[PDB]
Amino acid sequence: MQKQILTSQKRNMYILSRCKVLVKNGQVCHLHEDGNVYTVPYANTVFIGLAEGTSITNEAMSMLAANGVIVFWTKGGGYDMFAADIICHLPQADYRPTKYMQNWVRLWLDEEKKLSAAKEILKMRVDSLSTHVHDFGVDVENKRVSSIVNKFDKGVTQATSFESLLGHEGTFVKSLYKEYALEYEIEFKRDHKSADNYNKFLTLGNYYAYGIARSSLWALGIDNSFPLLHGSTRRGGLVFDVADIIKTSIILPLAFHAADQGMSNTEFKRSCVAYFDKNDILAYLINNIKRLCME
Amino acid sequence: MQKQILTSQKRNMYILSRCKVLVKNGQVCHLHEDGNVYTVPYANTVFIGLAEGTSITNEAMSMLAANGVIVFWTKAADIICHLPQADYRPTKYMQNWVRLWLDEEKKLSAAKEILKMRVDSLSTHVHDFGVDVENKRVSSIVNKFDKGVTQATSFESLLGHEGTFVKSLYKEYALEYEIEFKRDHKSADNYNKFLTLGNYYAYGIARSSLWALGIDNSFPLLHGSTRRGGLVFDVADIIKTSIILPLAFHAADQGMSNTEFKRSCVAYFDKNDILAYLINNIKRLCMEN
Amino acid sequence: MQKQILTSQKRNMYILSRCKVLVKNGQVCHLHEDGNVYTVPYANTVFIGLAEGTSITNEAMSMLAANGVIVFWTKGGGYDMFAADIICHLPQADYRPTKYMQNWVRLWLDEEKKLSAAKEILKMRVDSLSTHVHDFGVDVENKRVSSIVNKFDKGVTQATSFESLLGHEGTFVKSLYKEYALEYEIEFKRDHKSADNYNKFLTLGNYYAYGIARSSLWALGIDNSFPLLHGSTRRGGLVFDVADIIKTSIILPLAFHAADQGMSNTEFKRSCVAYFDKNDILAYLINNIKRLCME
Amino acid sequence: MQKQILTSQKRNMYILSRCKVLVKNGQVCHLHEDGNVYTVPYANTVFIGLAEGTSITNEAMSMLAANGVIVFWTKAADIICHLPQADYRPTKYMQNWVRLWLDEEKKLSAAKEILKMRVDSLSTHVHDFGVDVENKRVSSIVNKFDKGVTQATSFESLLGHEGTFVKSLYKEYALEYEIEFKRDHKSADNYNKFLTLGNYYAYGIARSSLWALGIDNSFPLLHGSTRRGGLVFDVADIIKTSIILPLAFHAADQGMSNTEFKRSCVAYFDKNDILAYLINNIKRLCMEN
Amino acid sequence: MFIRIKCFSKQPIAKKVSREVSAYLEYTGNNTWEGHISGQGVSNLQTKLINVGKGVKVVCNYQDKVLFAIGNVAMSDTGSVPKY
Amino acid sequence: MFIRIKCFSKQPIAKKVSREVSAYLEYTGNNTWEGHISGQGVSNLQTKLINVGKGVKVVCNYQDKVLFAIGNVAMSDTGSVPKY
């Protein structure tokens, strides 16, 4: 079914699941598997995307790209994107990259403002774990969380070298793992190779955070390969160095929570997708690069 | 799980008209109206072009794009495409490319290199006939292309220079291969239908050269009023006029249909390892640095 | 089965039909289709021939051609040979063509004695007509036969050019069809294209005459293509020319009789082969080649 | 009823070892001890040579003889054969041949011509490797053969001179292809096995060029004490040292079996049409006049 | 001049075309005949394939490109005749 | 380089070899996969068929010279294998 997602200022992501899209009466329409068909709007549409079990005909794309909209392909949930073309200035008359490309490469090429962008993206990590509050588990206003937030605020603001930033990054994640470990009466250490349910849930949630990060940076146009905190010779650097921002805020308590009461991976995926939809997370990251870029 | 078959060794090409692309029994395939089902070699396909009256499902798109097979849409003009994004690219190639790209002079040198590589395409795939290596007109015209693209005063100075080149090179072979057809998307003769069905092979070879190694398409080297779509024409011009055109006039004069044409294009493209050549020759442009 | 045929002085054609020829006890043996296996002699054998349904192994010719015999292939009856090696002076020590080859090319290369050989070859055509008798049809000693015979002897000794010799041969065969047609109460005109029984049995008997002529030619060793009476650009020269000896003597009465009571082609083949074996024709063709060559 | 495929465009050649050759369903074939037939394309077959433990029946011999596939018996040395004789040969070729041949000087002229065309065999046929066109020893050895056969005082002067040549050339290629084997009919090594399975191809191509254009074998151009077998040896030396020897040394050094040897020799024969070639070169001798 | 025949005919036309073309090429298996043959030999071959009659489905391949094909077949861009 | 693959194996392993080689070349007809792969390409092909296991009967052809062969197939003599 059709699901609406906000990107910058209006609901402009049209995810279609299990439907065949075609041209009806000279306009793009789509019939769901139950047999009934809806048309699409044109003025309110900039991102149109296809989920699992969807087919779409050639004249549909011909008149979609005639008048300035862009189609993409995801997995289920609409966030783990796998196939798309690229957002430019406009897809018909001027094929130039957007200004967000311009500001990100100009901030990358200047080293001191690169360090400024690194300390600000950690400060938005602090802001993201402060603002997004969940109704289970760790509250973000207790003594321990505020203590490590103030400590790491001073630690990032004093720091001037990158290896220090990954040092405070590792100290951040290890103090945070011990925080939700002590809040749920467990002893824990994070590991990819652990076969228990906790580590596999945080690994799947970490890949889902990669999915929503890749979808958001494509929605602003930015490619996967422009890292800022990780090394330059790392495949998928930008998705990691933007996904850690949303990881330690939301995906770690969600993963730990679904690891405590132990529901299945499909319903845990559904819980993450629904929470990404209601608290408009893609709009939050889109506004985040929209405030790192213009400076 | 096996290394996912590296992408210089993908060997099958398709322009697909009047069919339905899906997957059955773990095999990607397409259907005509007779209930008969084709086979698509996903581990060695480059790309699938999707003509009029055609559509592709999502699960077959996923299984082709996991191996990185590019699907694009036919309706030279505005052409609509899909690149695989789930597989994580080597950041080093297009990283050095964007270091090149946002500087205008290095963008200019890359444009000059990629379009002077057309002569390397014309010289290293050799098994032509008819005009062959030169008819004392195609050598002069590729020399005048070399002069025009070595000039390279701006990106919009040669915005439609390849449009004049497809015009002049579709007339130029035609004075020895007797017909008087021009460049048109709707000319009912066999020549223009053939040359419209054939440069999209160059489009798809260029695209799945662009998927794995280097540039994501919208970072172009030729923009203007008439070059609409981006880098894909700049890297499909390598083998548009070099390969499709002599085989085009051959297969249009000697009188056989679409099918043995696209046999001939698989044979010519896939004897000299031209997708592999395209990867390792755009690798010289991505990591020139 | 096994059949003995004479060429010069001994029964030394060994025609074998329907038998697998193998090596038994280090010697050439042949096992028949009834299961019986028989050895071959070596001193009494110079020509061994393989008729219909006859196989033979590699070691078999290895000690056939170790000790000096020649082997050939033929149809049923042992007279229509199709596959053979070629007669030399000796198959082991010295590969030299025989003196019969020598004297026939020498009698070609002398023109007047070539014409002498031509007049002599129609003379023993006349002698073969006078010699071989049959218990049916035209008596070879009546008034008409003796009249045309003495007329063609004086015509042979008067003539000097090959065109008149060819016209004499045509006159002889056309007068013999007139006489043989008057003896069987028919009106006849010889023709290949006629589909009746008479002309088809003449063409079959003519091709049998070609077969026995080629058998005699290979028996003494001379090739099919060195003619005397016909033109130089005619294929199968001595086949036609030496078959011309018997085509009026034996083939014409047998063919006219066998088309007179209308027996089938296979029994007429068997009766022709019985005439070829019992009356032993190939010996007189071999002796006729011998009396041409040494002169 | 079709013209029965003239001899110059027949392409398949074989040696039959440890088999039984007969007719199955109008198809000439051979059987192993487990069946496994190998239906012989008699419209294109040149010849069937037969090694030890082999035989061929009369109906098979006749069906191969109607199109004229020459059957011989391999056990250099004495090889026994059966020429098809029911089909009537074109008269003028062997008529002119015997007219020259009984003259001893023109016999010498014909012999020096056919043996001097070995240089034409080595220069026309070129897709070799290893020694290739020369190793600075084989060019001198064909030069010394040219000297020896241009000498040509008597027929028994060079009666076994090519026997010394197969000796010296089986040692000469062997100093760069490392083994010290000699010319022997019973040596169990792979080199003498390959060069004993090779001369029968020369014999067979020579025989079925001697089947319809010109001469029946026992009227020869090389006789003596040690040259036993006739003219087929004389017209088999043309592809003895030029063709089968370098591929023999190739197959014996790189070390595969008999079957891929015969695969390579069939490829070499079909690539230049050496049947057709030596048909029209023995046409120059039979139809010189 | 190395050519290969693929035959998709039905019995008894398939056995008859196997008889007429197996006399010219060597039988590989699964109705395939690769082999070496002359061009005017291909001319008499396609003449006698015309004389087989209707119902025959034979495609001749020189390298990849089809020199000759007889009988109502549907081929495509890769020359795949569906799969089943 | 021009590669013709002939599979002589037995089902259901024949369908498994059809799955691997049909992911590499098109299905021309009757267990014959025509196409073109390179030397590194046929290297990954043969290591995939050696990962397939036993009972695989694959003969590859580059022009007329046999490039590789997997399995116990008695390709007798020079170019062919009939049986009856």
Side-chain angles (χ1 to χ4, degrees), chain C residues 99-100 102-106 108-123 125-161 163-261:
Chain C
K99 64 215 168 301
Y100 316 115
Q102 304 333 318
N103 245 15
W104 210 327
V105 202
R106 291 311 178 191
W108 219 330
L109 289 185
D110 203 303
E111 197 78 11
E112 48 268 30
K113 164 212 151 173
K114 147 171 184 167
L115 303 146
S116 182
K119 73 72 185 173
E120 198 281 314
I121 194 189
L122 299 320
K123 287 156 47 59
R125 180 212 294 254
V126 160
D127 299 322
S128 53
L129 183 46
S130 67
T131 309
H132 254 273
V133 303
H134 329 74
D135 58 352
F136 40 74
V138 175
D139 192 7
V140 297
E141 306 294 329
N142 52 56
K143 183 258 292 183
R144 283 307 307 137
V145 165
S146 301
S147 179
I148 57 192
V149 155
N150 53 55
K151 183 192 288 185
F152 273 109
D153 320 328
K154 49 179 82 138
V156 154
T157 82
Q158 62 91 21
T160 198
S161 67
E163 297 88 354
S164 100
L165 262 295
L166 162 53
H168 281 98
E169 160 264 342
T171 302
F172 209 175
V173 314
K174 82 194 170 30
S175 301
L176 206 47
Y177 324 143
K178 298 157 196 157
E179 152 73 25
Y180 264 90
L182 263 62
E183 202 265 350
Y184 290 114
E185 310 92 67
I186 63 162
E187 190 273 331
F188 195 56
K189 187 175 181 178
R190 193 228 62 71
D191 173 39
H192 335 305
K193 279 85 179 173
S194 296
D196 77 319
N197 324 331
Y198 251 112
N199 270 293
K200 83 183 186 71
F201 279 136
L202 269 304
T203 37
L204 262 71
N206 162 247
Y207 142 83
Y208 300 164
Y210 294 157
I212 73 166
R214 194 179 58 244
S215 295
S216 286
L217 292 214
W218 179 86
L220 220 38
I222 45 184
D223 203 293
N224 91 316
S225 85
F226 322 150
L228 297 164
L229 322 165
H230 303 342
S232 61
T233 65
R234 187 63 185 275
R235 316 165 57 99
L238 291 212
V239 188
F240 278 42
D241 268 341
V242 179
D244 277 318
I245 304 316
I246 281 314
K247 263 160 64 180
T248 52
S249 297
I250 299 172
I251 293 312
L252 191 44
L254 279 183
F256 260 50
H257 150 281
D260 177 78
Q261 84 294 30

Side-chain angles (χ1 to χ4, degrees), chain A residues 199-227 229-239:
Chain A
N199 273 292
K200 80 181 185 70
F201 278 140
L202 50 91
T203 313
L204 264 71
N206 164 66
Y207 194 89
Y208 300 155
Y210 295 153
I212 76 168
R214 196 173 57 245
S215 292
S216 46
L217 277 310
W218 173 79
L220 225 38
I222 330 303
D223 201 290
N224 201 4
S225 90
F226 292 78
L229 267 301
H230 267 218
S232 61
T233 65
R234 184 66 187 275
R235 316 162 56 101
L238 202 164
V239 71

Side-chain angles (χ1 to χ4, degrees), chain F residues 25-39:
Chain F
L25 317 164
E26 59 263 18
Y27 194 28
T28 292
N30 211 1
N31 293 1
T32 296
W33 286 267
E34 185 215 350
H36 323 266
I37 327 173
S38 162

Side-chain angles (χ1 to χ4, degrees), chain B residues 3 5-6 9, chain F residues 24 40-48:
Chain B
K3 68 194 167 286
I5 315 113
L6 76 93
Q9 80 186 108
Chain F
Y24 271 68
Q40 194 273 311
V42 54
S43 81
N44 311 36
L45 185 32
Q46 57 203 128
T47 191
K48 281 178 113 202

Side-chain angles (χ1 to χ4, degrees), chain A residues 225 234-236, chain B residues 88-95 211-214:
Chain A
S225 90
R234 184 66 187 275
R235 316 162 56 101
Chain B
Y88 295 81
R89 264 198 271 293
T91 59
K92 79 195 299 195
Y93 297 143
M94 105 290 279
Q95 209 282 330
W211 150 72
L213 176 132

